[PDB]
Amino acid sequence: STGSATTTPIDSLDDAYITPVQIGTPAQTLNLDFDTGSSDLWVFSSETTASEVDGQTIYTPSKSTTAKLLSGATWSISYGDGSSSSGDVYTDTVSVGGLTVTGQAVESAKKVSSSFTEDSTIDGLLGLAFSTLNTVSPTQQKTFFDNAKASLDSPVFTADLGYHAPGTYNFGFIDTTAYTGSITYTAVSTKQGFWEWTSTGYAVGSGTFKSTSIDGIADTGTTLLYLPATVVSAYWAQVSGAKSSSSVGGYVFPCSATLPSFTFGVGSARIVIPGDYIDFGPISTGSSSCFGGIQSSAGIGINIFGDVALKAAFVVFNGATTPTLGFASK
C-alpha cells in the first residue's frame, strides 16, 4: 500500500504545516501537525477542557463506531519549546492520504497548554519519530508509520515541504518526479529516539564550505534551523545590522536586508537554503526588526534541522531495519 497527502502552511511565515487526517467511522477529518521529532498522535477532542479549545476541530470518539477506549492508558508530553498536553487513549481507524491503519492509538487531550489553544489551525500532532519516545503509559504505543510499515510497498515516508506553498507527505514510495539530481543517503542513530544524523558542514552565501561534523535531528515539527553558536554567528555576521537580542530571544535583523543563502552538507552533497527562507518577518506588527530563521541551539542540547532546512530538500525517512535519511535538491 501507499498514501499521499498534501501539507499546507498554517500562515504566511510557514510557522508550521498541517495535513488532513481521517479518524474514526464515519471519518472525522482533523488537520494535524506531522512531527518527525515526536512519537504521539494526539488530538483536540470532546474531552478537552472547554476553556482550552478555541476554534480547533475536535475528535469525538463516542461518534465513531470503531473507537475503543484503551483501558487504563494515559499520556502526557512536554515539547522542547515548553508546550505540553495530556489525556487518555482510544484505538481507532486512522487514514492519511488513502493509507489506512486499524487499531491506531489516538491520544485524546484532556488538557493542552496555552500555545496549543492559541493556534486555532492545529487540531493535534501526528508523531513520526521512533516509537520508543511514545508517552502512553503503562503500555507504550506505536506511531502511525510503525503500524503501517509492514503493509507499505517500501518501508519509507517522504517529506516535501513547500516555501510559502503547499507540499506533500508520501508513505510507502519515493516520487522520482519530486526532486532533481540524486538522493544522498546518510546514517541515522536511533539511540535518542530521533531521526538523528551528522551533517558534513556548511557555507554562508557564496562563501567557502567549512567541513565540520554537525550532529542534529531532522524535525518537521520545529519551525527554524537551530545550529551551534559558532555557525550561527558566522551566518549573521554577513547581514549588516543583525544582532542577537536577549529581549526578543534570538537573532534579529533589519527588515530592509537581503539575506544570504545557507548551505548544509549531506555526505558529499549540498543542500542550499535560499536567503528568503530565513526571513520570519517583523518581531511585532509594524516593526522594522525581523526575526531570523537560523538560531543558536546552545541550551537546547541538540541541533535541530527544522522546517527552514527541510523545506529546501526532498527528504526520505527510510524505516528499513537499519534506518537512514536521504536528501535531494528540488
Coordinates of C-alpha atoms in Angstrom, one line a residue:
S1 CA 0.0 0.0 0.0
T2 CA 0.9 3.7 -0.2
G3 CA -0.5 7.0 0.9
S4 CA -0.1 10.6 -0.3
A5 CA -1.4 13.8 1.4
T6 CA -0.9 17.5 0.8
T7 CA 0.6 19.5 3.7
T8 CA -0.2 23.2 3.9
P9 CA 1.5 26.1 5.8
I10 CA -0.7 27.5 8.6
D11 CA 0.2 31.1 7.9
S12 CA 2.2 33.4 5.7
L13 CA 5.5 32.6 7.5
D14 CA 5.4 28.8 7.3
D15 CA 5.3 28.7 11.1
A16 CA 4.1 25.1 10.8
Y17 CA 2.4 22.7 8.3
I18 CA -1.0 20.9 8.6
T19 CA -2.0 17.7 6.9
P20 CA -5.6 16.4 6.9
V21 CA -6.1 13.0 8.7
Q22 CA -9.3 10.9 8.8
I23 CA -10.1 9.4 12.2
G24 CA -12.9 7.0 13.0
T25 CA -16.1 5.8 11.4
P26 CA -17.6 7.7 9.8
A27 CA -14.5 9.7 9.2
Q28 CA -13.7 12.8 11.3
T29 CA -11.1 14.9 9.4
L30 CA -8.6 16.8 11.6
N31 CA -5.7 18.9 10.5
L32 CA -2.6 17.6 12.2
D33 CA 1.0 18.8 12.5
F34 CA 3.2 15.9 11.3
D35 CA 6.2 15.9 13.6
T36 CA 9.3 13.8 12.9
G37 CA 10.6 14.9 16.3
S38 CA 8.0 13.2 18.5
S39 CA 6.0 9.9 18.6
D40 CA 2.5 10.6 19.9
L41 CA -0.6 11.0 17.7
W42 CA -2.8 13.3 19.9
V43 CA -5.9 15.3 19.1
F44 CA -8.2 18.0 20.4
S45 CA -11.3 16.2 21.4
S46 CA -14.7 16.2 23.1
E47 CA -12.8 15.5 26.3
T48 CA -10.6 18.6 26.1
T49 CA -11.2 21.2 28.8
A50 CA -13.7 23.6 27.2
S51 CA -11.8 26.8 28.1
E52 CA -8.7 25.3 26.3
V53 CA -10.4 24.9 23.0
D54 CA -10.5 27.9 20.7
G55 CA -11.5 27.2 17.1
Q56 CA -9.9 23.7 16.7
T57 CA -11.8 20.8 15.2
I58 CA -12.3 18.1 17.8
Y59 CA -12.4 14.3 17.6
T60 CA -15.5 12.9 19.3
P61 CA -14.8 9.2 20.0
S62 CA -18.5 8.5 21.0
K63 CA -19.5 9.3 17.4
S64 CA -17.0 6.7 16.0
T65 CA -18.3 3.1 15.7
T66 CA -14.7 1.8 15.5
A67 CA -13.4 3.8 18.6
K68 CA -12.5 1.7 21.7
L69 CA -11.2 3.1 25.0
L70 CA -7.7 1.7 25.7
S71 CA -8.4 0.8 29.3
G72 CA -6.2 2.4 31.9
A73 CA -4.0 4.2 29.4
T74 CA -2.9 7.8 29.8
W75 CA -0.4 10.1 28.1
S76 CA 1.5 13.3 28.9
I77 CA 4.0 15.1 26.7
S78 CA 6.2 18.1 27.1
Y79 CA 7.9 19.6 23.9
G80 CA 11.2 21.3 23.6
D81 CA 9.6 24.7 23.4
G82 CA 7.8 24.3 26.8
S83 CA 4.4 23.4 25.4
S84 CA 2.5 20.4 26.7
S85 CA -0.6 18.2 26.6
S86 CA -2.1 15.1 28.3
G87 CA -5.1 12.9 28.4
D88 CA -6.4 9.3 27.8
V89 CA -6.3 7.0 24.8
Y90 CA -8.6 5.3 22.2
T91 CA -7.8 3.0 19.4
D92 CA -9.5 3.8 16.1
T93 CA -9.1 3.7 12.3
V94 CA -6.7 6.4 11.0
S95 CA -6.1 7.2 7.3
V96 CA -3.6 9.5 5.7
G97 CA -3.9 10.2 2.0
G98 CA -5.5 6.9 1.3
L99 CA -3.3 4.8 3.6
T100 CA -5.3 3.2 6.4
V101 CA -4.2 1.8 9.8
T102 CA -6.7 0.0 12.0
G103 CA -6.2 -0.1 15.8
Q104 CA -4.1 3.1 15.8
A105 CA -3.6 4.7 19.3
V106 CA -5.4 8.1 19.1
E107 CA -4.4 10.1 22.2
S108 CA -7.3 12.3 23.3
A109 CA -6.4 15.5 25.0
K110 CA -8.0 16.4 28.4
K111 CA -5.5 19.3 28.8
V112 CA -3.4 21.4 26.5
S113 CA -1.1 24.3 27.2
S114 CA -1.8 27.9 26.1
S115 CA 0.3 27.8 22.9
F116 CA -1.9 24.9 21.5
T117 CA -5.1 26.7 22.5
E118 CA -4.0 29.9 20.8
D119 CA -3.3 28.1 17.5
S120 CA -6.7 27.6 16.0
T121 CA -5.3 25.9 12.8
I122 CA -3.7 22.9 14.5
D123 CA -6.1 20.2 15.7
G124 CA -3.3 17.9 17.1
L125 CA 0.1 16.3 16.3
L126 CA 1.0 13.1 14.4
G127 CA 4.4 11.9 15.6
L128 CA 6.8 10.3 13.1
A129 CA 9.9 9.8 15.3
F130 CA 10.6 6.3 16.7
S131 CA 8.0 4.6 18.9
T132 CA 10.5 4.3 21.8
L133 CA 9.6 8.0 22.5
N134 CA 5.8 7.4 22.7
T135 CA 4.5 8.6 26.1
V136 CA 1.5 6.3 26.6
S137 CA 1.5 4.5 30.0
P138 CA 1.5 1.8 31.2
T139 CA 1.7 0.2 27.7
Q140 CA 3.7 2.3 25.1
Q141 CA 2.0 2.6 21.7
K142 CA 3.3 2.6 18.1
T143 CA 3.3 5.5 15.7
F144 CA 1.2 5.6 12.6
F145 CA 4.3 4.9 10.4
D146 CA 5.4 2.0 12.6
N147 CA 1.9 0.4 12.4
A148 CA 1.7 0.9 8.6
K149 CA 5.2 -0.2 7.8
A150 CA 4.8 -3.9 7.1
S151 CA 1.9 -3.1 4.7
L152 CA 3.8 -0.4 2.7
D153 CA 5.3 -1.1 -0.7
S154 CA 8.6 0.2 0.8
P155 CA 9.2 1.0 4.5
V156 CA 9.6 4.7 3.9
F157 CA 7.9 8.1 4.1
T158 CA 9.0 11.3 2.5
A159 CA 8.6 15.0 3.4
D160 CA 8.4 17.6 0.7
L161 CA 7.6 20.9 2.4
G162 CA 6.9 24.0 0.4
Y163 CA 8.2 27.5 0.8
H164 CA 5.1 29.7 1.2
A165 CA 3.2 27.0 -0.7
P166 CA 1.7 23.5 -0.2
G167 CA 3.8 20.3 -0.2
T168 CA 3.5 16.6 0.2
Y169 CA 3.9 13.7 2.7
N170 CA 4.1 10.3 0.9
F171 CA 4.1 6.9 2.6
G172 CA 5.5 3.8 1.0
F173 CA 7.1 5.1 -2.1
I174 CA 9.6 7.6 -3.5
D175 CA 8.2 10.0 -6.1
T176 CA 11.1 10.3 -8.5
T177 CA 9.5 13.3 -10.2
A178 CA 9.6 15.4 -7.0
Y179 CA 13.3 16.1 -6.8
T180 CA 16.3 17.0 -9.0
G181 CA 19.6 15.1 -9.3
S182 CA 20.1 12.1 -6.9
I183 CA 19.1 11.4 -3.3
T184 CA 22.1 11.2 -1.0
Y185 CA 21.6 8.8 2.0
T186 CA 23.3 9.3 5.3
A187 CA 23.4 7.2 8.6
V188 CA 20.9 7.6 11.4
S189 CA 21.3 6.9 15.1
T190 CA 18.0 5.9 16.8
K191 CA 19.7 6.0 20.3
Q192 CA 17.7 9.0 21.4
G193 CA 14.5 8.1 19.5
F194 CA 15.0 10.7 16.8
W195 CA 16.0 10.8 13.1
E196 CA 19.5 11.9 14.2
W197 CA 22.2 12.3 11.7
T198 CA 25.5 14.1 11.1
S199 CA 25.8 16.9 8.6
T200 CA 29.2 17.3 6.9
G201 CA 29.4 21.1 7.1
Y202 CA 28.1 24.4 5.9
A203 CA 28.6 27.5 3.8
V204 CA 27.3 31.1 4.1
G205 CA 26.2 32.7 0.9
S206 CA 28.8 32.3 -1.8
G207 CA 31.5 31.6 0.8
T208 CA 33.7 28.5 1.0
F209 CA 32.4 25.3 2.5
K210 CA 33.5 24.5 6.0
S211 CA 33.9 20.8 6.6
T212 CA 32.8 20.0 10.1
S213 CA 30.6 17.4 11.7
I214 CA 27.2 18.7 13.0
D215 CA 25.1 16.2 14.8
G216 CA 21.4 17.0 14.7
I217 CA 17.8 15.8 14.2
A218 CA 15.5 16.0 11.1
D219 CA 12.4 17.6 12.7
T220 CA 9.4 18.6 10.7
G221 CA 7.7 19.8 13.9
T222 CA 10.3 22.6 14.6
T223 CA 9.9 25.7 12.5
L224 CA 13.5 27.0 12.5
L225 CA 17.1 25.8 11.9
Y226 CA 19.0 25.5 15.3
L227 CA 22.8 25.2 15.0
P228 CA 25.9 25.7 17.1
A229 CA 26.6 29.2 18.2
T230 CA 29.8 29.4 16.1
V231 CA 27.9 28.5 12.9
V232 CA 25.1 30.9 13.6
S233 CA 27.4 33.8 14.4
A234 CA 29.2 33.2 11.1
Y235 CA 25.9 33.4 9.3
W236 CA 24.5 36.6 10.9
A237 CA 27.9 38.3 10.6
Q238 CA 27.2 38.5 6.9
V239 CA 24.0 40.6 7.5
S240 CA 24.5 44.3 8.2
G241 CA 22.9 45.3 11.4
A242 CA 22.0 41.8 12.6
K243 CA 22.4 41.1 16.3
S244 CA 21.4 38.6 19.0
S245 CA 18.7 40.1 21.1
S246 CA 18.2 38.7 24.6
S247 CA 14.9 40.6 24.9
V248 CA 13.5 39.1 21.7
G249 CA 15.0 35.7 22.2
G250 CA 17.4 35.3 19.3
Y251 CA 19.0 36.9 16.2
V252 CA 17.1 39.7 14.6
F253 CA 18.0 41.7 11.5
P254 CA 16.9 44.9 9.7
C255 CA 13.8 44.0 7.6
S256 CA 15.5 46.0 4.8
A257 CA 18.3 43.4 4.5
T258 CA 18.8 40.9 1.7
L259 CA 19.7 37.7 3.4
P260 CA 22.4 35.3 2.1
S261 CA 21.7 31.7 1.5
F262 CA 22.9 28.9 3.8
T263 CA 24.3 25.6 2.6
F264 CA 24.5 22.4 4.6
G265 CA 26.3 19.2 3.7
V266 CA 24.8 15.7 3.4
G267 CA 27.8 13.5 2.7
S268 CA 29.5 14.9 -0.3
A269 CA 26.2 16.6 -1.4
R270 CA 25.0 20.1 -0.6
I271 CA 21.5 21.5 0.1
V272 CA 21.1 25.2 -0.4
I273 CA 18.6 27.2 1.7
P274 CA 17.8 30.4 -0.1
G275 CA 18.1 33.6 1.9
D276 CA 14.3 34.4 1.8
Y277 CA 13.6 31.1 3.6
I278 CA 15.5 32.6 6.6
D279 CA 13.2 35.6 7.0
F280 CA 10.5 35.2 9.7
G281 CA 9.2 38.8 9.4
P282 CA 8.7 41.6 11.9
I283 CA 9.2 40.8 15.5
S284 CA 5.9 42.5 16.3
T285 CA 3.3 44.1 13.9
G286 CA 4.8 47.2 12.2
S287 CA 8.3 46.7 13.4
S288 CA 11.3 47.1 11.1
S289 CA 13.2 44.5 13.1
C290 CA 12.8 41.0 11.6
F291 CA 13.2 37.6 13.3
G292 CA 15.9 35.2 11.9
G293 CA 15.3 31.7 10.7
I294 CA 18.7 30.4 11.8
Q295 CA 19.2 30.4 15.6
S296 CA 21.6 29.1 18.2
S297 CA 21.0 25.6 19.6
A298 CA 23.0 26.5 22.7
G299 CA 20.9 25.5 25.7
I300 CA 18.7 23.2 23.6
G301 CA 21.2 20.5 23.9
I302 CA 20.8 19.3 20.4
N303 CA 21.0 20.8 16.9
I304 CA 17.7 20.8 15.0
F305 CA 17.2 20.7 11.2
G306 CA 13.7 22.1 11.3
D307 CA 11.4 23.3 8.5
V308 CA 13.8 26.1 7.4
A309 CA 16.3 23.4 6.4
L310 CA 13.9 20.6 5.4
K311 CA 11.8 22.7 3.1
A312 CA 14.9 23.3 0.9
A313 CA 15.0 19.5 0.2
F314 CA 13.1 16.4 -0.7
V315 CA 13.7 14.2 2.4
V316 CA 13.4 10.4 2.7
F317 CA 12.8 8.9 6.1
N318 CA 13.9 5.3 5.5
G319 CA 12.5 3.0 8.1
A320 CA 14.3 -0.2 6.9
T321 CA 15.8 -2.5 9.6
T322 CA 18.7 -0.1 9.7
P323 CA 17.1 3.3 9.3
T324 CA 18.7 6.0 7.1
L325 CA 17.9 9.6 5.9
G326 CA 18.0 10.8 2.3
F327 CA 18.2 14.3 1.0
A328 CA 17.8 15.6 -2.6
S329 CA 17.6 19.1 -4.0
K330 CA 14.3 20.1 -5.7

